[PDB]
Design an enzyme around this catalytic site. Structure first.
Site, PDB file in Angstrom:
ATOM      1  N   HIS A 163       2.222   6.971   1.956  1.00 36.70           N
ATOM      2  CA  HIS A 163       1.263   8.067   1.893  1.00 36.70           C
ATOM      3  C   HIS A 163       0.989   8.646   3.274  1.00 36.70           C
ATOM      4  O   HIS A 163       1.511   8.172   4.283  1.00 36.70           O
ATOM      5  CB  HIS A 163      -0.065   7.541   1.336  1.00 36.70           C
ATOM      6  N   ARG A 185       0.942  -1.111   0.000  1.00 36.71           N
ATOM      7  CA  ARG A 185       0.000   0.000   0.000  1.00 36.71           C
ATOM      8  C   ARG A 185       0.989   1.167   0.000  1.00 36.71           C
ATOM      9  O   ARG A 185       1.685   1.402   0.988  1.00 36.71           O
ATOM     10  CB  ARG A 185      -0.842   0.030   1.274  1.00 36.71           C
ATOM     11  N   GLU A 237      -5.237   7.330  11.742  1.00 41.53           N
ATOM     12  CA  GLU A 237      -5.662   6.016  11.270  1.00 41.53           C
ATOM     13  C   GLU A 237      -5.426   4.915  12.297  1.00 41.53           C
ATOM     14  O   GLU A 237      -4.341   4.807  12.863  1.00 41.53           O
ATOM     15  CB  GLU A 237      -4.920   5.685   9.977  1.00 41.53           C
ATOM     16  N   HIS A 249      -2.303  11.284   5.415  1.00 40.56           N
ATOM     17  CA  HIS A 249      -3.604  11.928   5.294  1.00 40.56           C
ATOM     18  C   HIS A 249      -3.857  12.826   6.482  1.00 40.56           C
ATOM     19  O   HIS A 249      -3.111  12.802   7.459  1.00 40.56           O
ATOM     20  CB  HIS A 249      -4.749  10.917   5.147  1.00 40.56           C
ATOM     21  N   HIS A 301       3.181   6.863   6.224  1.00 44.56           N
ATOM     22  CA  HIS A 301       3.295   5.438   6.495  1.00 44.56           C
ATOM     23  C   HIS A 301       3.057   4.570   5.262  1.00 44.56           C
ATOM     24  O   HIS A 301       2.696   5.064   4.192  1.00 44.56           O
ATOM     25  CB  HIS A 301       2.291   5.047   7.582  1.00 44.56           C
ATOM     26  N   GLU A 333     -11.219  10.610  -1.097  1.00 48.19           N
ATOM     27  CA  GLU A 333     -10.052  10.659  -1.974  1.00 48.19           C
ATOM     28  C   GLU A 333      -9.173  11.874  -1.706  1.00 48.19           C
ATOM     29  O   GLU A 333      -7.953  11.803  -1.840  1.00 48.19           O
ATOM     30  CB  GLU A 333     -10.492  10.661  -3.445  1.00 48.19           C
TER      31      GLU A 333
HETATM   32 MN   LIG Z   1      -3.108   5.254   5.675  1.00 42.25          MN
END
Ligand SMILES: [Mn+2]
Ligand SMILES: [Mg+2]
Ligand SMILES: [Mg+2]
Ligand SMILES: [Mg+2]
Ligand SMILES: [Mg+2]
Ligand SMILES: [Mg+2]
Ligand SMILES: [Mn+2]
Ligand SMILES: [Mn+2]
Ligand SMILES: [Mn+2]
Ligand SMILES: [Mn+2]
Ligand SMILES: [Mn+2]
Ligand SMILES: [Mn+2]
Ligand SMILES: [Mn+2]
Ligand SMILES: [Mn+2]
Ligand SMILES: [Mn+2]
Lengths: 372, 372, 372, 372, 372
Positions: free
Chosen positions: B88, B85, B94, B90, B133, B155
């Site tokens: 990235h 994954r 999380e 955000h 992460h 998104e």
């Molecule tokens: Mn994430």
């Protein structure tokens, strides 16, 4: 200049603003990598109404001018020698950077303790929300940038001493102080806001002693005295609640970028970034995720903005040093460096992502260099 | 099945969805005690679009699917062996629970300190807002539940490493790292998001040393290692900021309810409850005050919700164990047990309220038993 | 089934809902052309609480279940033979389609004029906002779909005759009608909502004459009596304010799609589309602009939605006819056909856009065929 | 220039933007009559990102740039000879003024009727919400101003023909037109938006005939053909739904002010005014009630705004003619002239208000002269 | 008085407001039928700040005083003989009822047509949004009720002639009228708002002729001249856009209820009801659906409100006539009478609902009697 890039674009055929086009090279002709809808992140103080008073002036950039900045607003204030910004208070906390000259500030807290001090070029002050204060320029006069922690900052935000009294029954004021209405008949009929006044005496002679004691923490900070983070292309001076103790809702950084240098690619994991360009010329691309990115040009005045977590950099595109402020509504400054991030991961893992080899990962640095 | 209860209701005469009716017995035929308008508190991942990529998939349940959950959103992600994954970050914090398999995660903080660790079934991780992460499945692949602390998660919430670079001028990237544009000509033209990759080596070989030191607190937590609160009908494993130190905005509890058992009647005095049903079948009645109550059915997938302070219980209505997660956006887990509450009050006072005698108050327990 | 498409996706490793996955083939495995965040556009009545009463039932899908539908809400109501939906009124206008059986409706306008009529399968009714009405099923009972022009439709939306009286001082009711409190002592203590009752007599015997005259326009409409737009793959029956005069805020279309047929690619230039699937199975891709598109599956029950101007189509993916309703909150039905649009433009101009030749433009039709 | 007015103000001591200060004389040094907080009412297209494409460019000013304008947004679009603005549609209605060159437009309505026409300098077009259209520049190329009736106009507002097809399953497109997937394999993989193309032939050869007939009203309007309201200092050309029939949501006026002239003091009793300055230089003071007023400067590009009912005037402060557009989101243009208003009241009544004599009321005119 | 009803309630033990308790008998001791949370629907002008000026006064009740009334606000204005309410305009439409005295009003429309007329007790006026007007009391002075169609009506809503001029550059005003700055040096420095003035002459002498012609429809209406709906307990005079043509956004009704009478049980199917009590004392229970109802007391001043479609009645609980106004923001007045509604339905159907016999349905009337 013309909005043409390779085989894209065309000459402008209608009446235009050539002066502004020249100031926005990267907007008239953006990078090929720019894409998608991105809010406006730039606004000039020169494009605002300037309130002129006997003793100076004041102009502001708020959410009414720059919509994206909902949490921070700013005022560019100028005071002539000895001029006074009337004793007042507001709902918002106030942070300031002295760009030119010097001034004496006063503030009394909720416990009746007073703090009076002189602020020179490169110094800051922070007044917690609701605490009353004043500013009086010294012999060189003064011009500074104020930042308030609410983008809606406006006229209904500031309470002036004389305005309050002018709108309070005379009999009530008289009773409040134990005097006669006649004794206060000369009170101003309207607020002063900013007014001319004789230069004050030495600071030591103004200090007021009280039964409440000295304030726990100073409301002013000598930013340029501390050792800055020195990089190859410039330097960064940071002031947040960890060093400038009272500055709980505003974290700041004064950044200097030499010609040919740039504030490296990074983002902030805590909150939005508000910017003020003191001098020089720059360009910055803000990466808003999901293939969205837009480049903006900035110079002297100009207010800039970088929404929370968006990737960005600030490149000096001029021949003179680039100097700007990075402001955050938080109790600490924090950033994540793209370079340092990748440097702290397994080399092959980074290579797997970028489709690049060891020749690239070998240039990564585990040490953070804000300006390269 | 037919929506008939005693002399109330009638047979369905129009075309219907019998399969869903069978899954929602307590909705087609609610308890006689249900009453009033109550928002929807249930949504299945099977009713969402599944984003398929080379290496796995990802589907989400957000406020756009379940309106009542404005503060929390979730993603069910699957990764094939070795699949990555993409690196990235955000705006949202999380939290994750590994349901199947295992994976290696990386994260670098704002001080340049890295943390790399392997996560197995029953383990958790929590990545503070804005910290970059990645996730890479190990030899068994991996499937896990992610929870973000903003229901609007979408998104525009996630920033990918390669997407940022793909939207940054090549000359700027080159200058940022001190390389030539030619040296980075092979950078991806579009983001990867999820991509196939060879399995990584041993964890010890991936650990990266740095001049910044080790992170203060771990970003992963072995939930099943600690002693759970063991009741007669099941067990509860709690992980909040008091034990999983970094998990400041997410408090969680893994609840197992044996057949014939139930999570007792209780409510949360701190915040809303978000639920994910890992396995089994259940029913829950949410009491919304002022004579309002509605019963919902849940099974495997399914996301559930209990607005702040509303009374509820979770009964196992199947033959297999019922396993679900209770998530809260707060720095601690807290609940008030109906049984314990009444047990801690004067017996005659409780009797005066319920119009019941000593035979009832004698069964009350001063000890809290989450599952009975 | 597994979420795998070519070399993308993977098998599900955690407990799952296989029944729902089978109902959502195009969601578990979406088209390769789907992309971007799109709100949920599907919700099943089977996933809602069913209010059971002596005489029938009622379940609803509102903005609390399907957030995207802020302007329209729906109720699936069932009445046993002779059962009555209590005299009431609400702020919202109400539109209905009789799916099964028949019923007698009453309505009195603001001028004291009454309208009483029988409604059979395929018929509609529209009650303007605030006008009082009732429904009583005939000998076969009845089941119908109601649509209200406010997505927030709820309990505070409907006023019941007996509930009003039960909450009005007895002395006031007595004075209002010129009777004694004793004469109205038998009034219900609580509302009835839906209640069993003997079948009514012939319609002609119920007609009430008055000094106010007959209503200007009928509140019921025989949709299946008119000639439908007949295409090769199905038919469309439209009812809006141009033919069903009183239906000012609701425009509707009953669409039948034969196996192997599809409602063609089109969009609505006036407002959002709300859908109810009466029978059959389908899939629809909603194109939301800027490279965003998501496919959804629908069957029997199911409520669907298409935000204003978004491109879409509805394909029958089953062996039985697909029958659904298209509802719009507007005074007229309107759509733009992709085929007709291109057919009405210069052939070379269309070719320049699609990079296709005359072989393609030759198939375009200037006549609109809703179902192909 | 310096922000000094009499004994108020002071010289600027910090780095500044002299070019912008020179463009905003009445902002750096406002009238003494300006007072109070007033939102920003000015924004330049030169301060926006210019999207460059093969065939032209497009830049926009929306609510994200000018917050006060919540109901109207604008795009300055440029097309090279023969270049095409891809067939598309949007939720918003679109109004346009051809500043330079000419172009051919197409539009097909909801009844399948097509309208194709050429638009030259001084002409307008109006495309109702949701109706599909295109623009193709002729031999001189074209540059025009577009105005959309929603300030939030953005990327999610416009649907492109090729983008829709690129995000629709190939098998569905094939079925929709009755062709094979192979026959449409050459469809574009991404939208075109704006693309180069050979100049079209004569208009008469492009006209497409259809079984639906001709459109009821034209979608283009020759503004400069009609007789304008001719005043002593300039002229006004008005186009609203009373003369340009299809333009139901946009009323407009092209105003020309000769040097030494001014658009008189007036206000609009119907809605907000949005402005675009085509050429020249001006200043306008907006009176916002309760002693609030602020003056703004405008030139070429620049977008201006006057909130509903606020008093204003537009004075030419240059040596060349001042030309600008006044746009309103309404079905008609309407204004109240200060002069005409007072001229239509009893002379002594007006004198009682202004404390002026007959010498003043004698100059009042009962005839409205927009530009004096 | 004490808040005791049967065995419910108790004496007040803390300091209280006995005068207000006496005015609110049905609030201190509500009907047993009242239940549930209902917003406040009552507010007195006596509880508002009164703005005193030389020539009269003005006090207002807005959404800031009565939150439920978001669409309508009101001002109680008083003018001494000859006093003038300064020429002004506002964004909101204005409706008025002359309670005492008389006054002359002026208004000029957007076409330059003037209307001047005298208004006496019982007369109304309606000024469309944005049209400038004035009011001047005649020899008896005047006191009237104004209603504006926006609950947020405030200071930023009204633009005064002299305030506009006081905030416009003198050089601009001079240029606008073609006079010298010296000729307008005596213009007021501040607005007048309300000011004393000599009584005007006869109406006929004030009429101003113009080249624009007479206004299409009168802006004043003689409400008491028309025949009212006469019932047994009182009368109702209605004025909406069907008879008072220009009053497009305000529908009104003057209701007189004799002692021992009551405005019957009814509701409005179109919009909210705003009330002003001119004289007398009353009580009204508002039925808000879902078992919610609350009773309020009203007298003289008092503003009342009835949200859209809620059931209500207005009973005279005093010895003098009850006179009040019912105001609606709509182009027509409309109500549904409970009595008439039931009278127009099959007798046995109504009996089935109320559990009452023919003795009750026999008293129902097919004719609407507003006051019984
Ligand atoms: Mn994430
Ligand atoms: Mg891109
Ligand atoms: Mg109950
Ligand atoms: Mg795509
Ligand atoms: Mg002023
Ligand atoms: Mg009750
Ligand atoms: Mn301050
Ligand atoms: Mn930064
Ligand atoms: Mn719980
Ligand atoms: Mn109904
Ligand atoms: Mn459709
Ligand atoms: Mn367009
Ligand atoms: Mn204007
Ligand atoms: Mn007025
Ligand atoms: Mn009423």
């Amino acid at each position: 200049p013309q909005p043409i890039r390779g085989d894209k674009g065309a000459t402008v055929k209608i009446p235009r603003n050539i002066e502004r086009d020249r100031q926005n090279p990267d907007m008239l002709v953006p990078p090929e990598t720019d894409h998608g809808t991105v809010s406006n992140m730039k606004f000039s103080f020169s494009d605002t109404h300037n309130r002129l008073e006997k003793g100076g002036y004041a102009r502001e950039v708020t959410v009414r001018e720059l919509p994206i900045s909902e949490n921070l607003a700013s005022v560019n204030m100028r005071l002539k020698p000895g001029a006074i910004r009337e004793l007042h208070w507001h709902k918002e906390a106030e942070w300031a950077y002295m760009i030119y000259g010097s001034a004496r500030v006063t503030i009394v807290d909720e416990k009746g303790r007073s703090f009076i001090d002189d602020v020179g070029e490169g110094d800051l002050w922070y007044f917690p929300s609701g605490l009353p204060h004043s500013i009086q320029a010294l012999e060189e006069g003064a011009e500074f940038l104020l930042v308030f922690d609410d983008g809606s900052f406006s006229e209904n935000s500031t309470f002036q001493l004389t305005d309050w009294l002018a709108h309070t029954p005379k009999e009530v004021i008289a009773a409040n102080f134990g005097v006669t209405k006649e004794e206060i008949s000369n009170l101003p009929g309207k607020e002063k806001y900013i007014f001319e006044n004789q230069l004050p005496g030495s600071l030591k002679d103004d200090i007021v002693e009280g039964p409440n004691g000295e304030v726990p923490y100073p409301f002013t900070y000598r930013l340029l005295e501390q050792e800055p983070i020195e990089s190859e292309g410039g330097k960064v001076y940071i002031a947040d609640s960890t060093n400038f103790k009272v500055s709980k809702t505003i974290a700041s950084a004064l950044v200097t970028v030499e010609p040919g240098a740039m504030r490296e690619l990074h983002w902030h994991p805590n909150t939005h970034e508000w910017q003020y360009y003191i001098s020089g010329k720059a360009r910055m691309t803000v990466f808003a995720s999901d293939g969205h990115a837009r480049t903006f040009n900035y110079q002297a005045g100009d207010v800039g903005y970088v929404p929370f977590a968006m990737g960005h950099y600030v490149e000096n595109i001029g021949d003179e040093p680039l100097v700007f402020l990075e402001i955050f509504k938080d109790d600490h400054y924090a950033d994540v460096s793209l370079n340092q991030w990748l440097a702290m991961l397994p080399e092959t893992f980074v290579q797997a992502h970028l489709d690049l080899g060891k020749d690239f990962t070998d240039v990564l640095s585990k040490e953070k260099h804000p300006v390269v």
